[PDB]
Each structure stands twice: as C-alpha cells, then as structure tokens.
Amino acid sequence: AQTAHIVLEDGTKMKGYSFGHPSSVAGEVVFNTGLGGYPEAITDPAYKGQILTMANPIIGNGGAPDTTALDELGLSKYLESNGIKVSGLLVLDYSKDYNHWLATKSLGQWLQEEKVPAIYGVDTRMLTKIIRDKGTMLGKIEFEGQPVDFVDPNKQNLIAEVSTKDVKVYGKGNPTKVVAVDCGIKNNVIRLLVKRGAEVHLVPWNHDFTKMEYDGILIAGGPGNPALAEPLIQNVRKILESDRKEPLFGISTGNLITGLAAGAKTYKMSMANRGQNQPVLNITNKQAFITAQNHGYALDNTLPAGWKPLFVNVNDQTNEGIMHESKPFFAVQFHPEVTPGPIDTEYLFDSFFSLIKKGKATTITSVLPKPALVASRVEVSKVLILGSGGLSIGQAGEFDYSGSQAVKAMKEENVKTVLMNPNIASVQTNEVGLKQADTVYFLPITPQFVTEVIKAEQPDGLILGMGGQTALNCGVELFKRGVLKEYGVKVLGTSVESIMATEDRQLFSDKLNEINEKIAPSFAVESIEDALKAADTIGYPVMIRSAYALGGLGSGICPNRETLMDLSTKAFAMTNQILVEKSVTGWKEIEYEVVRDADDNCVTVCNMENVDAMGVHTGDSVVVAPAQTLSNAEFQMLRRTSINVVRHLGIVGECNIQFALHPTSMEYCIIEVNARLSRSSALASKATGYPLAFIAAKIALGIPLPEIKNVVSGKTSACFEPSLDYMVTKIPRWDLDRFHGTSSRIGSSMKSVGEVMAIGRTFEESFQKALRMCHPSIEGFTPRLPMNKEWPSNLDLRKELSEPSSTRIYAIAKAIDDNMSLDEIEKLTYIDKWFLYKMRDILNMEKTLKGLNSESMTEETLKRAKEIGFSDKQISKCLGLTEAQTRELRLKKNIHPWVKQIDTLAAEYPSVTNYLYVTYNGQEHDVNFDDHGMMVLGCGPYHIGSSVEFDWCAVSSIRTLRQLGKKTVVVNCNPETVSTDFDECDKLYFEELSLERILDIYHQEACGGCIISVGGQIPNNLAVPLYKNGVKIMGTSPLQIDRAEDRSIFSAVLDELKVAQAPWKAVNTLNEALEFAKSVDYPCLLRMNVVFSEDPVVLTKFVEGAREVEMDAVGKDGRVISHAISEHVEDAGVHSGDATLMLPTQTISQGAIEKVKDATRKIAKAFAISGPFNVQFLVKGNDVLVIECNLRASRSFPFVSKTLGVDFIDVATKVMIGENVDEKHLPTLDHPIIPADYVAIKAPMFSWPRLRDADPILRCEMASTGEVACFGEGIHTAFLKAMLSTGFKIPQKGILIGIQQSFRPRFLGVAEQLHNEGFKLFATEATSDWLNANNVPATPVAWPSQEGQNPSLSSIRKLIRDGSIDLVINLPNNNTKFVHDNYVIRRTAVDSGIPLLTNFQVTKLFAEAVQKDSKSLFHYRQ
C-alpha cells in the first residue's frame, strides 16, 4: 500500500499511509480538538488552504454520507459547503470499514473523488504539540516523485476564493429579508435563518449591499486574513457611518470584518481557537457557553467609542464578540450554527430576529437571555458526608474514590468534615492527609445512626450524593422524616426534591413529559396486579426496573405474563414501585456525564458508548469512550437533550444520564438519570482526567465552574468539555463459576464484581489491553475462553451470540473465526458492526502471525501487531517462541511503546500533572525519565477475595513514600481506586499489570525499585519473573516468596522449625488418595473442596472443631516489629475472607497465643522477611497448626491497622526502602498492643440477592464481596453494630429454625435463649418436634416440596410474605437429608429480603448479643 510524508517547514517529517487522493499538496498545517463530525468539519470553508490535523485518533467510522443530495433549499443536505475544503487531511487511524445508517461510501473514496490528499498512521498528538503556539506552521503532504514547494495561503484573500460569485436566494418568499455577506459561510447559518422566517440573499463578499433594501444583515465566514478584504471592510464601514439601523449580526469573520469597519485592529493568533469545547463568557451577565470555533485571526481588545466587548474566551482572554452600545449591531467570533459542535448558542439567531421585529433601535443586551440562576456561596462550617458502607455488586469502590475527592474540596474551602462509613477497608476512612475527614464514624449508614451522629456533631451541611444508593436512600428517608429540617442541616448540591424526581420512576416520567421529552411507553406500578395490566396495554416484551435502586436490582426483561409474575414478585421485596416499560433491547445505549453549577452553567464532561446494547446493564457492559459510531447530529441531539433535562430537573452538581438510541434513525428514549456520583462518573473521571467528584463538591458550595481550576492544565478552568486524543475501553470482571446456581448470562441486573479500563490510540489497542486486564488467563481478543476452559461439545454458537453472557466476547471471536458473517453477528448480538470490523482485523493479524516465524516476520508486521494491541505472549504463540525470546526479538528491531499524557484537552494546553498511559501508536514520549522513582504496583480489577483493602495497602505505601520525599511511580488499571487518582503520586501509569508492560515502564523510567507486596496476588505473582528481568524488588526476596508458595519446601521448613501443620500429601491416583484419607481419617480438603467419605491433587487433613487465628505482621531483617492476632467467630472451614474477625482474641488460650507468636518468629526468620506478611493458624486447645503463609499484605491489614492505631503499611514501606523505624511504640512480639477498653469486629458483606439462584451458604471457596467493621466496649455491641452495617436487620417477629440433627446438643441453648428473649419460634418438621420435646415452644412449618400435603401446616413463603417470619436460621452440614428443600428455604429468605443465618457460631453469638449505641473507634481511643 502507498505511503507519503507530512513534512513541516521546521524539519519535522512523518511517514503515513495514503488513504485519499494520491497526490502532493502544500498548505498551513492546523489542528482542531473537536472529536466528531468529520464530514461536516472537512466541508468547513474556514479550512480552505489548510492541512487539517485531527485530534480524534480514529477517523472514518461512519464513512461518508450522500455528498450529492440537496435539501429543499438547494443546499447540501448533509454537508456544510458544496465540497471538501481542506487541502489535506492528517489522522492517526483510518477506518477502511465503516458502518452507519446514512453512509453511502468510505471517507477515503470521498476524499479520492474530491482530489484531497489524506494520510494515516502519523502521530497527530506530536504534530499538535509542534504546531501549538507557532502562529503559522507551513507543511505539505509529499508523495514520492511529486515534489511541491511550501506555500502560505494566508498571503491570499481566501475570502474571495470561497465566496459565491453571484447572488443566491434561500427561503424564497419568506417575510424577512436578510442579506448574508458570504465570506465562506457554512450551510447551517442559512438553514437557521430560513427556519426563522428569513428570505436570505447570499451575496458575494465584494458585493455593494450598502443601498440594498433589507430588514437585517449578516456577515459570516471562515477562511483568511480579514484585513485582505478591503472592498468589504469599506462597505461595512459605510453602513456604520450612515443612519441605517437594520440589525447587523456577524459570525467569526463577521466579527473581524465588523471590528475592522468600526476601527479596531486584528492580528494573527499564535495560538488559534479550533475546537468544539471552547469556553466563552458573556461579559455583561457572566453566563458561560461552550462553543465551536475555527479561527486563527482575532480582534484586538481595544475598540473604538460606542463599541464594547460582548464575549471573551475563558481560557486565553481573547475577544469572542462585540456590540454597539445603542444600535442593534453585534458580532460573535464563534459559530452558533455549529455543525459540528454544541447547540448551546443558537439563541443568538432568535436574538437577531427579535432586533428586527422590535425595530426601534433596541439594544443587543435587551434581547439576550437573562440568568436563570445567580450563584451565591452557601455558608457551611461543618459537613457530614455519607459513604456506601461495605462493598457489594453495583456499589463498589467508586464512592471511596469520589468521597475522598469531596473531602479534599471541602478542606480547600476551610470546611470541617465528618465521615460515616463502616467500610474499614476504604481509603476514605484513614486519619491522615488532605482527603481525610476531621472525624470518622464506623457505623451503619441508616437513619437511626445518621441521626445520632447529626445530634452529636451538629453539622449544617450534608453530602448524600457520594455514597451510592445507600447514602441516597438514607438521606431521602431523613428528609421525609424532617430530621434535616429539625437540626438545621442543609443538603449541599442537588436537592432532595431533584433526587426524588430521578429515583421515583413515575416522577421522572412526569418531569420529562413536562418538557415533552421522549420516553418509551411505560407505567409505574405498585403491585403485581397493576404490572400485569400495564404489560398487556404496552405489549410484550417489557422491561421492569425498580425505583430507589441502582445496578438493575429487581430488574429484568419479561417476554411473557409468567416471567413478569416471577420477577415483579421478587422486585417488590426490594422496592415499592417498579416501571413496566416497552422493550428497546438492541438499541444503542449511550451515557453522558453532566455537570451543572449554581450559575446555571451546564456542560457534558464525558460521553460513553456501550458496546453491548440495551438490555445488558451499563455496569455489565463493555463500554468505550468517547463514542465511536454516532454522527454529529446524533451526538449533539443527545448532548443537548441531556443539558435540557438536567437543567429542568434542578440538578446542581454532577449526574449521569442514559439514553436508548435507535440504531438506524434519530429516534431515542431517555432511560434514567442518576443525580449522584456513580460508577460511570468514576470511569469518566479516569478517562478524561476531569475530577467530577471534586468539581461536584466545589459546586455544592456555590462556586461556579469558571472559578474552579482545571488541575491538569493548571492554567484553565473546569468550564469545558474535555477532548480525548485516545480511546478508553472498560470491561467488567465477573466471578461466577463458584456460584453453581447462578448462570453466566448477563442482562439488566448487574452481576460483575469489578472492572478495568485500558487506554489506546486504536480501538484494537485499547480493547486487547482491557481484556488482558480482566484476568491473568486472558491473552487478548481470542476465540478461546478464560481460565483455560474448553468450549462445550454441545455448543450452540448462535445461542451464545444472541444471549449475552460473561463469555460472549470470546464466542464472537469464535464465530468470526468459524466464518459466520459479520452481518449475522450484528443481527444476533446487536453489537454495532463497526466494532465487529475491528475484531475481525485483530483475528486476521493472528492468522497472518501464525504463518510467520522469527526469521519471516518483518518489522512492518510486528509494528502493526503491537499497534492493534497484540502482546508478546500472543505473538510468541504464533511464532513458536517463548515470551522472553519474542520480547528480545522486538527490542532488537527497536519497536517499543511510547509514554503519553492525558491532559484533558488533546494537547491544546500542556499538562502540569503526569497522568500517563503507554501506546505503540506514536513517535515520541510526552515526559522525561529523570526521576528514577520507586514503583508501586496496584491490585487490578476487584474480584471476590481481592477488594479495596488492596487499594488501601497500595495507597498507604504511596503516601508513605511521598511523605518521605521519594519520587513514586504507580501502575494500576482499576478505575474505582484512589490509587488511580493522579494527585497521589508523581507518575501514574494507568496500565496493564503484565510482566510485559511493567518491564516496559520500569526500564523506561529506570525506576530505583519496585514494591510488589501491597497490591494482592497479581503483583506478588510477578515477583520472580520481575527479579529475573533486572527489576529491583524492595523487601522480602522473590526467592523467599517462591520458597514459601512451594507447598513442599514450606512444609519441610516448618518440619525443620518444629512448627506443626495438618497432615497433607500430593497424589496422582485414586488409591493413593483413599489410602492417605484412610491413614489420617475423613474429612479431607482437596485441591477447593472437602470430602467426608470414600464416596496431581493435594490432600489435607480437615481439622474439625477448630478455631482459626490470623497473624498480620511486618518483618524487618527476619524479625517481627509489628503484629496483630485476631480470632474468627466461625470455626475453621469458613474461609478467612467470609469470616467475622474479632480483635483482640477472645477464646484462645494464652499458651496458643505464645505458640502462634513463636511460630511467627521462626517463619519470619526462615524466610528473611522484610516487609508485610501474614500467617493463618488452626487452633484447638493448645495445638497450633499453620495453614498458610502469605509473604505480602493480607486483606485484614486495614482492619488491624486502624484498630490498633498503627499503619502497618507505613511501617512496612519504611523497612522496605531502608528508612528508620522506632520500634519502641510498635506492637513487636515482645510488646504487643492489645486493646483493653474496646473490641473491634469485622463482618463480611455478601451480594446474594444479585446472584440469582445462588445457594447463600459458605464453602471453602470464598463468596463475600466486601467488609465492614465496628467497635464496642464489648463483643456483643461491636458485633451488633457490624451486623447492622451489613444490612442485617434485627428481627421484630418470628424466627424460623431448621438445623441438621448433629447441631442439636449445641443449639438447644441458643434456642432457649431466643425463646427467653421473646421471639416466637417456627421450625421444620424434626426440629420442631425436638424443640417442643425440650419445652421450647415451636410452630412446625411445611417443607416447600410438600406444600398442600398437610393442611395443618403453613407454608414458609406465606409466613414470610405475611410478616410472621423475619429471620431464618438454616444450619446444614454434610449429613443434611433435605438438601434441595433447605436450599429453597435459604434462597426464599434472600429473595424475600429477610436476614438469613447459616453458621452456628454466628447464630450463637447473635442470640447472645440480642440479650441487650453510637460510638466509634475515636471514642474508645480517647
């Protein structure tokens, strides 16, 4: 394929691939930061003579429209002039393949027809930074054998080259005569005039209009130095010097011509204004507007008498408008007709027409919109902020991140802050730093406790928009009850009224109907009977979605009556109102993040295109940013609707809005608005570098957007809409294999436990990184499943495609491979074909590479493979090499990635921060590598067993390094984390946590070292590979980490040290297994799974009736210098992470503690530990056995650290980098710190209702999704507070009890106790006979499998529904007889929303604790 260069006059040269007309051309090189509307854009007459450099790296997605179709006025239907006006085009990536309902050909074919050169494959960012602020960069697209000289088209009057040669009329017959002086007018100026009643006489630029009859005159244009248009400047001057008073309205060139006619100077700007995100302020009334501009000359701000500036540019203070003080003459420097751009200043046409109609020398100011809000700063001295509580599916760490930004904002403005969050693992809840509240309460986020806090703290402000639905619902309940009014607590930001209007689906409908906005046929109902009615009126299929919820709780598609019955019943256990709505499954799902301040300035900060269509929850969807398959008309229609809706709803702060867009028309539906920070705002903040929560919080104090700094640029405001010169992809992470009852299908109700975000400058690059980030077993986009699972032999590939699931991406790969047409895949998946083209490109590269080897693969091919996201591992498998070999081969050809900044403005202004990503699609680095900082690796996506605790550890380490004056480099790919907030470190790489990429970054920075022990499993598993590739690992040697993860070495070490452990053995045979299990007695663990009977694999003696103890510790040179021991409530057999933890220990013998300590002393020494680690122990009397050792921070490190008032990670970080440490006050083995006056309890969080049909029962594999912790004078109090913090609700009614027979001896007393506390008891058959035989009264109930077979017995479903039963106790074990029946009982409780207890110890402790406050850690530490 044919190449060509872009050559600039300063020597820069870049080789591109030609996609336009293969011929050379010379002009002024410029750049424009607008991301969409390339077809409209390239037909702008302002680009005459110019070589355009596109910020958007991905160009051509929608091909080109009908370029010959006219409208009924005789103007181009889809374009802004009669043809392409750029002399040439420069992009990074060209989509040869396109997909849009209005596309009639590729953009390259269009370019070829119009004889316009175009090349792709050039670093448009580098170009931009070179052009930036040089006034005039000349360049040329030069083809081989076609030399051209540099030329400056500005030496010509370009106005004349693009003006009409004779007078043309549009709106023939219309009442209002408007002369339009054509200086390169865009078509939409004409459309907007005619639509308002004008007959438009379009006249050449040198036409003598001065004695013509007209009712108004307009002057519009784009290209050229206006000073070269003397005939015209003269003519306009004659008008101004006369007595004529016809309103005059100037656009862009018009501003400059009119200024010149009046007597002002113009100048060529060194930094032009070219974009769709250019902020202007109306001087007069302080209203701000986002504008499209495309001008390189500007008016000097010194104007003659009678003329005043109207608009100013908020970035650079240049003029953007003028007005006469008494006559109806005005001009704007920007394009209110946009196309492309934001439809925010179209009112200027209405204003013009009002000047004509009033016609008595009315003034420009008198007909301009008056401010609808006047931002007065709210006075607040103390604010309460609410957290989400424990993490759960759909309500994850995004709020830790948001709420930390909010506190920072509050502190900057001298506002005292109180935080409530029982999530002890949150970074939010730390004591130290600019993001930490002055006071922290670890308590339930429920009205009972928030009231107590309010009373005690007497705050005057409340932030309820940064804790998900928990905080929202709590705040609305407080409001409804008048608690806020009662204690004088103002809701800061969006009002409870606006909130209710977005959370109640009916009120939402009412609001949008008030402004005749577009929604789908629907009815909000409050009963199952009413839902059935609604569905019959609307017609099946229908979607139901709940009020006062997020993440699709209780939602679902209903193809029929019976599905609707099942789902609405379940929905009503969790909300009071559902919306029953006509299905728009398959429409494109589009999100916007919207900001609105108290001055009524309102912008869309980000927009996201969901790759999975409507019907798969945004949260369980692949999502790209910015959008890729919208037209300017689509994108701007939805943007402007967002702004209207958000305005009408009274929202002040930030919010998220969702649309369904018809895939082949302009039809759309507004689905919901989330008037609060969200998982979507977190993502958008990371994608754009715009900190939405920080901004939201400043706005909540009445500071308007123009007065808030863009911290990234350091020189501009937050009144703008970022420009991305890269694309981000977010993919969810699911963990479903362990929940046997739950399918891996996905739909309207979230099931994902985490997410990743990758950045690239091609879809393919961004996309394959993001897939690798989700799980270490995923290599990129391949037709192979994760976890090395084989495809089923009974696979129905069409079914997989048509029914979304956690693995559909790979099923698409497979289908493309197996030669299914792209058209049929789009038809079944609903995924826009454009995205499918990219996927096919990826698989073609795989085919190509498979036919090559280390000798046969060329440099051109390798480079391309990397540019579309292939890792060295993927390549290695094609070539027949190892990964190391392939890395070597690549570097040998000097093919490496480049380091680029996110600056929010696609290089318009440089970044003062270093928020970074890495890409193969560039020709330079955006930063230096002189720091040689200390690298810290983060956790990756959250998943079960790996949550925000590992962000806590990482952030603690990052903060410790900063506090010690050390340069830091962070790598993490989780958008929800505070570790991926750029203000925490010197260099944040939002990047893959692969060996490949860490090596890339380490070696590129020449980092002084790397800390791999504070981000869980991912970084720790890289310890040895890193070691071997020249990386300096801080702390405990990777050789020691290997030794310790080697079960055989570890065990032999323990034998040497005389430290006990459970008998174990690795086996290959069933007979070895059975022999061993026989030799130690059943039960046995199996590697996870336990077995109790006869009816390679590691086997371990399962020790029954055993306590479990955690040792969390820090080593220095093999000595332990901080430690903490906690006891689980539950016996060994419940996994650590599902366990409830007590600190300090409660029932452990003092001799066992001594053994735990001695075993930890020896282990630390044997593995020369310098850093954090953990050891887990079985304890039975004085027998102390080691279960496992982890040579890294454990998930209980936050709990332990905060509880004991010592940052274990601060200590450990200082050890690892050789900083000094005073051990006097640390909890060494010799002087532990043991709380005397209080106890701490950590409880696990679960997400059973969202894991449809899952058996809510603890296995040896872990199931919890988060944690809370609370404190108390004793264990009962602390335990009750912890449990309430999980959502557990103390029963007020009857308790259902069903237990396996063997629990009877121990349970009798638990039951008597519950009875003596006054709880009416219900029980399953045998359990009820037994209780009554022991004089504990119980009412028997029927088994679910036997309902109707005995009329003396009530069904459990009915007793729950009736409200007779509001706690279920179900205690199965291995000898449970009625396995299914008891499963049904357990799942019934979950799906009815009543608490369920399935562990005996937890149940015992509960009973003891109900036998009988609002304090927190800081109380007890005093």
Ligand SMILES: Nc1ncnc2c1ncn2[C@@H]1O[C@H](COP(=O)(O)OP(=O)(O)O)[C@@H](O)[C@H]1O
């Ligand atoms: N009318 C509909 N037809 C098909 N899918 C829908 C419809 N309405 C909503 N959805 C899907 O359900 C998801 C959840 O709906 P939403 O109204 O966003 O509730 P939540 O606040 O719980 O996320 C949406 O993102 C979308 O994928």
Ligand SMILES: Nc1ncnc2c1ncn2[C@@H]1O[C@H](COP(=O)(O)OP(=O)(O)O)[C@@H](O)[C@H]1O
């Ligand atoms: N020998 C044993 N007897 C009884 N329970 C055990 C035994 N070993 C492990 N368990 C249980 O299984 C859980 C997981 O064991 P662990 O070795 O920590 O696995 P993981 O690799 O998932 O961390 C433990 O926390 C404990 O409750």
Ligand SMILES: CC(=O)N[C@@H](CCC(=O)O)C(=O)O
């Ligand atoms: C949970 C459990 O194991 N229940 C008992 C049933 C005892 C009863 O009849 O109440 C069982 O053996 O299935």
Ligand SMILES: [Cl-]
């Ligand atoms: Cl852990």
Ligand SMILES: [K+]
């Ligand atoms: K979606």
Ligand SMILES: [K+]
């Ligand atoms: K909502």
Ligand SMILES: [K+]
């Ligand atoms: K959303």
Ligand SMILES: [K+]
């Ligand atoms: K499953």
Ligand SMILES: [K+]
């Ligand atoms: K090969």
Ligand SMILES: [Mg+2]
């Ligand atoms: Mg929502």
Ligand SMILES: [Mg+2]
């Ligand atoms: Mg939603």
Ligand SMILES: [Mg+2]
């Ligand atoms: Mg473990």
Ligand code: NI
């Ligand atoms: Ni300007």
